[PDB]
């Protein structure tokens, strides 16, 4: 039976700087039989790449978008949203949406991999951890971890503040087509309105024929 595919990033940071090298690996148990090519979709466009690992030596602004990988005989993998900016300081995150009791890694990175020291991480404009150089990966994330995050650090000896990024830590209610869950209620409501109109017409005709067939 066909299996699901998964896409991994090297480095796993979904936010990278311009010109950085990122490798996208799509191994979703493709070894069911023989080796096979891969299908890559970027903004609904089938790129001419059919390799397991896609390498972007010089990431650009246009490289950002929606990335979906699919192996032959397997379903499409989960989409990955790549975000590339050109700021002095960036707050790289492993993922944008984290489930309950999940784990996600956050790291503050400087331009051209410059030395960054005395980094303070603020959540909802409130500092929660002061890290010298180590990442601030959080384990067992709860609903209280949802909010906006941004890291403020020192590039060489100059103070800089990274752009604010919103990370939503919620339950399994990922949502998107929950209004399509109202499609069945809307359809049955429309059907009941049609039935009510039919009943009105039926009772009017019944009264008319009662005055007729009396």
């Amino acid at each position: 039976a066909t299996e699901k595919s998964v896409l991994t990033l090297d480095p796993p940071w979904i936010r990278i700087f311009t010109g950085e090298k990122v490798t996208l690996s799509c191994y979703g148990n493709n070894h069911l039989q023989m080796n096979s090519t891969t299908k890559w979709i970027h903004n609904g466009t089938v790129s001419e790449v059919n390799s397991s690992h896609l390498v972007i030596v010089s990431a650009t602004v246009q490289d950002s978008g929606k990335y979906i990988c699919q192996k032959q005989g397997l379903f499409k993998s989960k989409p990955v949203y790549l975000n590339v900016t050109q700021d002095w300081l960036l707050l790289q995150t492993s993922a944008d949406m984290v489930l309950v009791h999940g784990s996600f890694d956050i790291r503050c990175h400087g331009w051209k991999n410059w030395n960054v020291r005395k980094v303070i991480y603020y959540r909802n404009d409130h500092a929660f951890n002061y890290s010298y150089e180590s990442p601030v990966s959080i384990r067992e994330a709860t609903l209280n971890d949802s909010g906006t995050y941004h890291c403020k650090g020192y590039l060489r000896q100059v103070k800089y503040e990274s752009d604010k990024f919103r990370i939503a830590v919620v339950k399994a209610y990922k949502c998107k087509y929950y209004w399509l869950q109202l499609i069945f209620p809307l359809l049955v409501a429309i059907l009941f309105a049609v039935d009510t109109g039919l009943l009105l017409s039926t009772e009017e005709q019944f009264k008319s024929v009662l005055e007729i067939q009396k």
Partner: protein, 43 residues
Amino acid sequence: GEPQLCYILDAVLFLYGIVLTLLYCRLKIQVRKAAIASREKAD
């Protein structure tokens, strides 16, 4: 846990609505046939 209950609820609601719509269509057809037959026979 939570979504399957509303899934089954919507499924049974649609089934009951379809059954009721078929019943009402049958009733409308029967009453129209009776009315037209009575009108043709009396007039």
